[PDB]
Amino acid sequence: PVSALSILSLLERVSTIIDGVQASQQRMEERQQQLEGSVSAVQSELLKLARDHGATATTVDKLLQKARRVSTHVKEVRSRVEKQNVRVKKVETTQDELLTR
Amino acid sequence: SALSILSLLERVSTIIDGVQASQQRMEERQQQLEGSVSAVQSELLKLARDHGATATTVDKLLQKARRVSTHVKEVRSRVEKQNVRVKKVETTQDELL
Amino acid sequence: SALSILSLLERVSTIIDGVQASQQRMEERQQQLEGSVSAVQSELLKLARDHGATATTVDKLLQKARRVSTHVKEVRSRVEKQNVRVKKVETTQDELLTR
């Protein structure tokens, strides 16, 4: 009913399928390796861009501090100019008085 | 030829058990890969948001720079106008005696 | 023992079915992951170019900051000289109004 030869036939049949499965596994292993390599590189570049952006952001915060400080200085100078104006007018108007006399 | 059948069966059983074990390892490797990809996607979006915040702040700094530069030119102008008024007063006093 | 041999081969066949099902799912997921990584690479590069532009603008803001700082110091210098010139005229006018 079941000859050694029929069994042999099944074995060669199973062996042929396994050959195909193994070749497919080889193709997939290669794709997984390449993908791991791509991910590793993206990780590295992402960390690098994070560091670069970190430096920019740190400069930006300094620029914020600086802008606040310069504004404060401009306000102070403006204040000094207005005070001088009061003083100049005092001298101007007094000269008007003397000159007319 | 019973021996040759048993030998071949043994090799096949051996080979498929290895193939199965390998497939399991590959399943595992791919799920680890999915996790790593999900992680980089997440970190990229976070960095994108962080940069967007920085770029937003930078535009404000541009705006603030324009305003300050205008204020400085204006204060300069006032100072020059006062210079002229002071010179007139100096000249007049030198002349008043 | 032919049936015991065929039983072992039936089990081998079931294992092959399971591996092949897994291989199909693995191929579907692998293509998806490869697409996802490609998208990450592209978006990362875009973010890098965008940051490059931001970094350039910041370097310009730094020079603007230096420039304006220099102008404020020059203006303040003139305000201080004018203060001395005004004091000069003030003190003399007060002198003249004495006696």
Ligand SMILES: [Cl-]
């Ligand atoms: Cl006078």
